[PDB]
Ligand binder design. Structure first.
Ligand SMILES: OC[C@H]1O[C@H](O[C@H]2[C@H](O)[C@@H](O)[C@H](OCCCCC3CCCCC3)O[C@@H]2CO)[C@H](O)[C@@H](O)[C@@H]1O
Ligand SMILES: OC[C@H]1O[C@H](O[C@H]2[C@H](O)[C@@H](O)[C@H](OCCCCC3CCCCC3)O[C@@H]2CO)[C@H](O)[C@@H](O)[C@@H]1O
Ligand SMILES: OC[C@H]1O[C@H](O[C@H]2[C@H](O)[C@@H](O)[C@H](OCCCCC3CCCCC3)O[C@@H]2CO)[C@H](O)[C@@H](O)[C@@H]1O
Ligand SMILES: OC[C@H]1O[C@H](O[C@H]2[C@H](O)[C@@H](O)[C@H](OCCCCC3CCCCC3)O[C@@H]2CO)[C@H](O)[C@@H](O)[C@@H]1O
Ligand SMILES: OC[C@H]1O[C@H](O[C@H]2[C@H](O)[C@@H](O)[C@H](OCCCCC3CCCCC3)O[C@@H]2CO)[C@H](O)[C@@H](O)[C@@H]1O
Ligand SMILES: OC[C@H]1O[C@H](O[C@H]2[C@H](O)[C@@H](O)[C@H](OCCCCC3CCCCC3)O[C@@H]2CO)[C@H](O)[C@@H](O)[C@@H]1O
Ligand SMILES: OC[C@H]1O[C@H](O[C@H]2[C@H](O)[C@@H](O)[C@H](OCCCCC3CCCCC3)O[C@@H]2CO)[C@H](O)[C@@H](O)[C@@H]1O
Ligand SMILES: OC[C@H]1O[C@H](O[C@H]2[C@H](O)[C@@H](O)[C@H](OCCCCC3CCCCC3)O[C@@H]2CO)[C@H](O)[C@@H](O)[C@@H]1O
Ligand SMILES: OC[C@H]1O[C@H](O[C@H]2[C@H](O)[C@@H](O)[C@H](OCCCCC3CCCCC3)O[C@@H]2CO)[C@H](O)[C@@H](O)[C@@H]1O
Ligand SMILES: OC[C@H]1O[C@H](O[C@H]2[C@H](O)[C@@H](O)[C@H](OCCCCC3CCCCC3)O[C@@H]2CO)[C@H](O)[C@@H](O)[C@@H]1O
Ligand SMILES: OC[C@H]1O[C@H](O[C@H]2[C@H](O)[C@@H](O)[C@H](OCCCCC3CCCCC3)O[C@@H]2CO)[C@H](O)[C@@H](O)[C@@H]1O
Ligand SMILES: OC[C@H]1O[C@H](O[C@H]2[C@H](O)[C@@H](O)[C@H](OCCCCC3CCCCC3)O[C@@H]2CO)[C@H](O)[C@@H](O)[C@@H]1O
Ligand SMILES: OC[C@H]1O[C@H](O[C@H]2[C@H](O)[C@@H](O)[C@H](OCCCCC3CCCCC3)O[C@@H]2CO)[C@H](O)[C@@H](O)[C@@H]1O
Ligand SMILES: OC[C@H]1O[C@H](O[C@H]2[C@H](O)[C@@H](O)[C@H](OCCCCC3CCCCC3)O[C@@H]2CO)[C@H](O)[C@@H](O)[C@@H]1O
Ligand SMILES: OC[C@H]1O[C@H](O[C@H]2[C@H](O)[C@@H](O)[C@H](OCCCCC3CCCCC3)O[C@@H]2CO)[C@H](O)[C@@H](O)[C@@H]1O
Lengths: 82, 82, 82, 82, 82, 82, 82, 82, 82, 82, 82, 82, 82, 82, 82
């Protein structure tokens, strides 16, 4: 439909946002979850407390990548320039 | 068949979204799963609890890359510009 | 629908702010959350204390990425130039 | 035959999607599998439980690279542009 | 209503300030907070003292990123050149 | 009997697919196999169970690189463009 | 308004000074703070001594990034050239 | 004796396939082999079992680089384009 | 107001001097301070001796970045060329 | 004798093949050999079994670089293009 | 006053000298100082000997960055070319 | 005296072959030799056995770089193109 | 006052020699000095022996950077070309 | 005198051969030597055996960098082209 | 009295030779020396033997950098081309 410098930059930008935005949170979620299951193996009676604190933490980390997602979707479906 | 800057940028962007988007979650899932199976060996009685928490964690990490896949699929099958 | 150097630079900027801005906080939140759940497994009675300090920590780290998000939203929705 | 910026970008993209897409899952699968076999050596009686959990994990990680494969295959066999 | 070298540089600059500016502090805050919750589990009676010292530390680290935010906001809302 | 942008890109692409595609799986397979032989030395009666789980794991990891090989072979023997 | 090579370089420089300038101090402050809270958990009676030493340390590290802030502020509000 | 972009790209491609394709497998084979000989020293009677699992592992890893070699040989001896 | 190659290089140089110049000293101060507060917890009676040696060390590290600041300030307020 | 893009690329390619191709195998051989001599010091009666398994492993790793060598020699002595 | 390739290179060079020149010495001073205060906590009667050896070591490391400083000051105040 | 693209590429290639080709083997030999001398200290009676296995290993690693040297010497003294 | 490619290259060269030339030695001196003070704390009576070996080591490492300084001084004060 | 692409490439190559060529052997020699002196402290009676094995090792590693020196010297004193 | 491609390359080359050439040996010398002083503290009667083996090792490592220095001095004082 339309191709210019800004449409080209928009699609690259969208991919960088979600692609790069998943690096930190992906690693961090693995580290937290790993400690969680180790803790459960160590003390199964704490499973409830452990899972609750993990779920909360997973949400904070997941939100970081969702910010990248939000930008991607704006660049694609509500682009202010093109 | 159309080739312009933006179609070219779109196909590259699609690949970077899923390619880069798999790095953190891939490493993270491995870390979490490794601790899970170590935990099951340590306390086989807790495997039900461990497996459920692991599954929850894997989902949160898988979703991060799936955001990448959504962007890629938008660029390829619902491209707003080209 | 305007395309120039600045609109293109703006979309790339928006993605870099939130993309790069999640790396450190994503990793850091994972480190903290991991220690939290390991602490809960060690001393389930300290769960309230651990959760409260974790939450406060997660907020400080989340805010770091949110500054990136704010910049991205300004560039997309309140751009001073284009 | 057809050769333009987009066909060239499409073949490079396809390689990057599966090439880069296998890095994190490759490492992660090794980490999880290594811990699985260490766990089986430690508690051979837990082999069934460990193998099931590992299998689930390997699938989650494999899927990440498969999203890359899908993008590659679309680019080579169902290209929307070129 | 304005596009030139310096408007383009300003938007990239704003993103780099807060994007890069969150890497060290993000990682550092995670390290400190992780030790804090581990400390609380170890010695719950010291929670108040630990929490107070952590809060101070988190503020010092958060400030480093805020300096980035300040540069970004000057560039966006009080730009000296454009 | 043919040289253009896309033939040149295709040959580089083929190399990157299998070249980069072997890094993660190569490292991961070494990690898993190392733990497997350490496990066998520790508990030789579990060799069969360890060997079976390792074999499955090696296949999952090998497949990641084979996806690269497949893209490379499509580019060389069934190229869609040139 | 003014736009030339030096204004563009000045805004980028300002971002780099505070952005890159926060990396080492950010990490270092986390390392020191983490050890401080671990020490307080170990010897709560030493909290006053530990907090004083930590505070002095945090100031030394904060100052490093502030030198970056100063350069940034000179560049934006007291630029010698442009 | 033909020289064009594609013959030049082909020779570089051939070298990158086998060059890069040995990195992960080279490292991985070392890791596995190291654990194998350490296992043999710990339990010399398990040598047959350790050797057999090592060999199978080495083959899986060697194959990863061989795919790179195959691509290089196709590019040198059965080039589809030039 | 003068803009040339050298004014542009000067402002960038100023930022790189203090920005890069803070990396090693920032990390180094954190390492030293971390060991100091650990030492005070271990032997509160030695805090006077520990604090003095730490202060001496922090100064030596702070001076390294201050050299960067001197160069930056020369480039901005006593520039020999522009 | 003859100089064109392809002769120039051929000589660079040759050097990259053997140069890069020695990185992984060089490190991996050191790791395996290191474990081997440690194992011999631990259990000198196992020297025969250890050395045999090491020799086999060294051969698999050495072959990875020889693949790079083969490509180099082809590019130099049996070049298909120039 | 004067702007040419060499004045521009001189100011960049000056900043690289002190900026890069502080990386190694900054980290090394932190490592040595960290060990020093740990040693003092361990054996406070050795404070004199420890501090003396540390001071000497700090001087050797500080001199490395001062070499960079010397070059910077020459490039700025005793430039042989411009 | 002839200077063209290919002579220039040849001299650079020669250096990259031996320069890069020494990295993995250099580090690998150090690792293996370090474990060897540690092993001799642990069991002086085994030094004959350790020295022989080390020598075998060093040779395999030295050969990897020698391949680099062969390529370099071919490029300098038996160049097929120039 | 001459400006050409070589004077500009010379000033950059001078800075790179001393800048880069301090990285390894800075880190190495820190490692050695750290072990020295830890050794003095362990055995204060060996202080003379430790100090003497440290000093000799520091000189060897300092000399490495001094070669960089010498090159920088030749380029600034005894330039063979410009 | 002579100046062309090949003389310029030759001087850069010579620097890269010995510069890059000393990285792996430099690190490796330190690793081996460190273990040698640790071993002598542990079993002083084994000093002769350890020193002989170390000497052999240092020679193997030194030779790697010497291959770089040889290429450099050929390029500067026996250049085949220029 | 001379400026061209090769004079410019020669000065950069001289800096890279000694700059890069000091990284590995600098790090390696620190590793070896650190172990030496730790060894002396552990076993002061072995100081002579440790010191002798360290001296030999430091010479081997120092020589690697001297090769760089030699290339640099040839380029500055006995340049074969310019
Ligand atoms: O809006 C841009 C207009 O400018 C064009 O010039 C060309 C220009 O010469 C060329 O350097 C430019 O390609 C170079 C731009 C780099 C691609 C960019 C890099 C990162 C961000 C995503 C992609 O493309 C323009 C085509 O969009 C054409 O003159 C015109 O058709 C086009 O519409
Ligand atoms: O035949 C010209 C066609 O291409 C134009 O874009 C030009 C553009 O101007 C030019 O700079 C560009 O060369 C620039 C190469 C940059 C490669 C780019 C890097 C990241 C993003 C993906 C790939 O080539 C395009 C050729 O397709 C127009 O976009 C298009 O309308 C037109 O159909
Ligand atoms: O600024 C307005 C002008 O935009 C275009 O300029 C563009 C041109 O299209 C583009 O290929 C070229 O891009 C060069 C690559 C830089 C792109 C930029 C880099 C940072 C991240 C955002 C993307 O540079 C020109 C900069 O002026 C065209 O010159 C013209 O169509 C239009 O008037
Ligand atoms: O006029 C439109 C032009 O479109 C293409 O030109 C292209 C040309 O192929 C390409 O090598 C050149 O640089 C293209 C950039 C390098 C290839 C690209 C890099 C990123 C990954 C995908 C592959 O730019 C030209 C456009 O600026 C056509 O191939 C060319 O024939 C034609 O002149
Ligand atoms: O001072 C602003 C000036 O910007 C343009 O000049 C520039 C223009 O940016 C672009 O085409 C080209 O540079 C564009 C590439 C640099 C993009 C930059 C990279 C890092 C910082 C963010 C984005 O060179 C032109 C040289 O004339 C216009 O040509 C000029 O009319 C306008 O006055
Ligand atoms: O579509 C293929 C076209 O390829 C050429 O265009 C290209 C050509 O590749 C080359 O000179 C130049 O780009 C060559 C540089 C890019 C090489 C590429 C980099 C990554 C992928 C592998 C190799 O730009 C030209 C722009 O016209 C020819 O000029 C054109 O006639 C031909 O049709
Ligand atoms: O004639 C003097 C020129 O001065 C500037 O041109 C500049 C132009 O702006 C710039 O994009 C282009 O490339 C400038 C390099 C990219 C921007 C720079 C990169 C490092 C960090 C600071 C930002 O070069 C032109 C000069 O060679 C003016 O902006 C331009 O209008 C004018 O043509
Ligand atoms: O493709 C055929 C043509 O080959 C040459 O093109 C070449 C040219 O020689 C070269 O300097 C230039 O190379 C540009 C650098 C890219 C080289 C390529 C990069 C990836 C790995 C392989 C090497 O690009 C042109 C691409 O078309 C010449 O244009 C011409 O003699 C010949 O007709
Ligand atoms: O309007 C032209 C003015 O700029 C000239 O320098 C030109 C220079 O020739 C040109 O290559 C340059 O574009 C080159 C862009 C390189 C950016 C550079 C990268 C590191 C150092 C800081 C930024 O732009 C300048 C524009 O200011 C002259 O230096 C000055 O006398 C004159 O006033
Ligand atoms: O076969 C290439 C033909 O093309 C030439 O153009 C020039 C071209 O302008 C220039 O960009 C090109 O240099 C740029 C190519 C980059 C060198 C390449 C990069 C990686 C792979 C190894 C080396 O060299 C060509 C010389 O071979 C000449 O026109 C002709 O003499 C030559 O034979
Ligand atoms: O002494 C340099 C003379 O050459 C100029 O050309 C321009 C040239 O076109 C342009 O590529 C060049 O900018 C490119 C040079 C890159 C900047 C350099 C990179 C690292 C070291 C520090 C900074 O700048 C020149 C301006 O100094 C002008 O023609 C003249 O005004 C100037 O005096
Ligand atoms: O005087 C021209 C001579 O050089 C030509 O090659 C040209 C070539 O076209 C040009 O792009 C090239 O500039 C390209 C610079 C690329 C540097 C290259 C990067 C990696 C490989 C080693 C160095 O310069 C050559 C100058 O020797 C021809 O190859 C040769 O026949 C001729 O004798
Ligand atoms: O060598 C003498 C000539 O110096 C200038 O050439 C310069 C030009 O100014 C510059 O923008 C351009 O620089 C290009 C960037 C490389 C700069 C160099 C890179 C390594 C570290 C030192 C800095 O290249 C030309 C190289 O000939 C001008 O051409 C001219 O004013 C003068 O006669
Ligand atoms: O016409 C043949 C040309 O051959 C040389 O030009 C050369 C020129 O020297 C060089 O700076 C330019 O870029 C050369 C690339 C940068 C230097 C090279 C980079 C890799 C490591 C070795 C050093 O390319 C020209 C050829 O394209 C001669 O020096 C020049 O006088 C002559 O114009
Ligand atoms: O052989 C030396 C020749 O050097 C120049 O050519 C060169 C000149 O270096 C420069 O402008 C340009 O290349 C300059 C960029 C390369 C700088 C180099 C990068 C790595 C090594 C250190 C510095 O290309 C010209 C091509 O003609 C002169 O133009 C020529 O008259 C002179 O004879």
């Amino acid at each position: 439909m339309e191709s210019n410098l800004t449409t080209a930059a928009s699609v690259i930008a969208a991919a960088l946002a979600v692609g790069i935005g998943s690096i930190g949170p992906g690693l961090g979620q693995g580290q937290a979850a790993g400690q969680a299951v180790e803790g459960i193996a160590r003390q199964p009676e704490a499973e409830g407390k452990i899972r609750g604190t993990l779920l909360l933490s997973l949400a904070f980390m997941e939100a970081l990548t969702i910010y990248g997602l939000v930008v991607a979707l704006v660049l694609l479906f509500a682009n202010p320039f093109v």
